[PDB]
Amino acid sequence: KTHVQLSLPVLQVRDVLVRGFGDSVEEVLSEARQHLKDGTCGLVEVEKGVLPQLEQPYVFIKRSDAAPHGHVMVELVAELEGIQYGRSGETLGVLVPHVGEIPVAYRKVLLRK
């Protein structure tokens, strides 16, 4: 399937134990896609002071379209030292590994895979 319905646990930035997916744009996009498939991917909602508490490169989910079955269509865009790899809509949040942190909410998304 080109798209997969996912429900992503929304984590508070200060709870997050593993604050990024790796060390290159290509690795973080790779790791993010693997964790999304394995159901081991969390979402942090981006506000003032969140991104400096996480590790670059960042992986964002961005709205790819204006929402089947409640699931917002999203795609992945990475960022490293102010350069983005991908072009998409509004940020829904930053992806991080989920290692059992308690979420505050779930974000229903349709991921272009």
**Structural domains of the chain, count:** 1
- Phi first, then psi, for residue 22 (nearest 5°) are 150, -160
Resolution attained, angstroms: 1.8
DSSP string, 8-53: EEE--GGG-SS--S-SSHHHHHHHHHHHHHHT-EEEE---TTTGGG
- CATH number of residue 60's parent domain: 2.30.30
* Sign of the torsion formed by the C-alpha atoms of 77, 78, 83 and 85: negative
Domain housing 16: 3-112
- Phi first, then psi, for residue 91 (nearest 5°) are -70, 125
The string over 1-37, giving b where at least 16 C-beta atoms fall within 10 Å of a residue's C-beta and e elsewhere, is eebeebebbebebeebeeebbbeebeebbebbbebbe
Q: Identify the experimental approach.
A: X-ray
Residue with tokens 């699931």: 71
Contacts of 78 (CB under 8 A, 6+ apart): 25, 28, 29, 57, 58, 59, 60, 84, 85, 86
Would you give the DSSP letter of residue 88?
-
Which residue from 91, 90, 96 is spatially nearest to 16, judged by alpha carbons? 96
One-letter identity of residue 86: G
Would you give the DSSP letter of residue 102?
P
